[PDB]
């Protein structure tokens, strides 16, 4: 039996493709963002937090992974909300 022989390297596994897995694309987003968030100084106009403030507040959820929204609605929402801001 596989589990009777080869289990126990981890205390708790998870299913293929779930959000909580260390190979999920969310984990890749987090790992990539950690390194990217520092490529420019804070004062620079090219700073990521200044350039894309809403991305830093992005929720990591199965919802945000499964729902295949239209991109153009998200670009409209982003320009619209920044115009309603300024």
């Amino acid at each position: 039996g596989y589990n009777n022989q080869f289990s126990g390297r981890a205390s708790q596994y998870v299913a293929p493709g779930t959000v909580s897995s260390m190979f999920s694309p969310a984990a890749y987003l987090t790992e990539l963002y950690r390194e990217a968030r520092n490529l420019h100084a804070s004062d620079s106009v090219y700073y990521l937090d200044t350039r894309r403030p809403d991305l830093k507040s992005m929720a990591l959820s199965q919802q945000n992974m499964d729902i295949e929204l239209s991109t153009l609605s998200l670009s409209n929402e982003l320009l619209l909300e920044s115009i309603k801001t300024e």
């Binding site: 022989q5 080869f6 981890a10 998870v14 897995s21 694309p25 490529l39």
Partner: protein
Amino acid sequence: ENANSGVISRQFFIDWDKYNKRYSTWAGVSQLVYYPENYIDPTMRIGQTKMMDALLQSVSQSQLNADTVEDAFMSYLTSFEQVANLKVISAYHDNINNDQGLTYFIGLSETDAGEYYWRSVDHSKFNDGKFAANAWSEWHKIDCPINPYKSTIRPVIYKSRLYLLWLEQKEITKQTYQTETDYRYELKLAHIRYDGTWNTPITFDVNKKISELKLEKNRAPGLYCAGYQGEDTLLVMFYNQQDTLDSYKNASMQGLYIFADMASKDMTPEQSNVYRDNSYQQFDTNNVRRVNNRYAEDNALTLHHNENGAQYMQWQSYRTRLNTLFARQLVARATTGIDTILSMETQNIQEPQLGKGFYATFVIPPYNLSTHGDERWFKLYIKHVVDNNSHIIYSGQLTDTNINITLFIPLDDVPLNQDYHAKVYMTFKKSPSDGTWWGPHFVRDDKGIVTINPKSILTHFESVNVLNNISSEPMDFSGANSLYFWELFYYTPMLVAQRLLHEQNFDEANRWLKYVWSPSGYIVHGQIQNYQWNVRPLLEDTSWNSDPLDSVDPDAVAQHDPMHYKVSTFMRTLDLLIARGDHAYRQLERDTLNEAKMWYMQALHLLGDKPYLPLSTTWSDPRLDRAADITTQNLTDLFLPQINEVMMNYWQTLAQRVYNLRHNLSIDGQP
């Protein structure tokens, strides 16, 4: 405009174009690190030996039969035996200090027109008193001709390239009108090329210099070769053989200079005296063969040929084996054929002990924090009554169980203390300091029996035993020939089984894969054997290491944790069972479909209960900002490991196949 140059220098942006720029490549790298068994292919492997590459292309064909694979295995075993019987002659140490650098060995095969093989080892990878298996390198054939007098060949490294000096000798007949005979001697230098071929040997006339050495009859002149730091010159010196280093202190040192363009000059006596006096300790007496270092301006490394046939390298307290007598004992196993070559007792052929010493068994006491501390590490230290520093001989982690550790304990040539001959003491986080009497002391008599000194205190050893009846130890799957031993016992059966799989010769693939592992069990001499896996390093490694190897090669990481190779064998067993079921299922008649069912059910109970995985858990949908800071160490801190998608896929395809067998479909699911 300007990225932070410090941030760009991070490894993540060095690995960018190669792995991290694309999500699929990053996921593949991360699984290849975490799940080696998926990407392990027996056909091709990094660091593959040349004879396994002979094997693969020999066995790769359309038709595979029992006789063909038997003959291919016999040729492979012939190659392995030929490359295993060779003996070392001489060596050179690449670095001024023995702690770092590389050591190059020269070995002769047992054939009349000898073949010479050069082997290199790395001292940096050596630690904890044991050379790492990956540190050793495979033997390489030397293409140029070598025909030395009395095996006077000595490698040297020059300008970071490997060079060979050997002395040839020839016979000529002086006329005196009575006819008389005499010899002439020609030092020859060769070097390897970038493509691993060997340049033509260049002759150097040494007849004057040897004739100045009043050699004994049929005695090989002492040849010293060393590469100078800074200046690119080969120091070549000829010295007369003497029994003691104290005699070399005034030897009339002959030699010559050899330059990069392979011009030469003689040594001046005044220069030779200096080159002698700085490095006289490296000269090989009639009683010792030493290894040379690069020239400099705490004994040297040494090669002993023991009477029992073990060759070993010694440095201070440390001895390491060089050759293996496995292939010389194997012939008895080969007389009864392949089924006996791969058997378990064959992997327990004894290695004769190296040097003079004894075997002692040490039992490590349980975890017991008050006598232990929080850090579970422990180290076994030896000390010898030369009263140098101690030396580590074993290092481990304290278990809650006992650990049984059997060690060869070296003994010096000379009993420099009358009361005890070795000290072993036990160190750990709680009590790292040594006590004068606070560990087992061992002493030997004239008849050579070792006993524990009653004056010594064993309180923090669970037991110490001396195995006075034992003068040998098991074959070593981590020593020098570890690569060839993993090459034969495990890799070759798996490669053969894999080749037989593609030819749909299931009956031969089952037995070949059954060599490495068989769920039914093993029967010997009419009795069932307790063990389940036929390979010793798979049988002994029963759970993964506390941390894996970080390496983008799946095979080095599986070599570091051979629990993975067990999974790779299990997965090839499931592949065989599924393929056999699919092949039977291709015939749609009633009787055969029940064979298809019993084949799938056979693999079904082997896989066992599909694991249940609770769909939602503690993971709480965190913000990317906060997930970043949790993951920034001073991903397992917040993301969990997933079950291997390939193992999940086996349950998916087996359940769907049984669904078709239960519903009278075909394999494409059509009524």
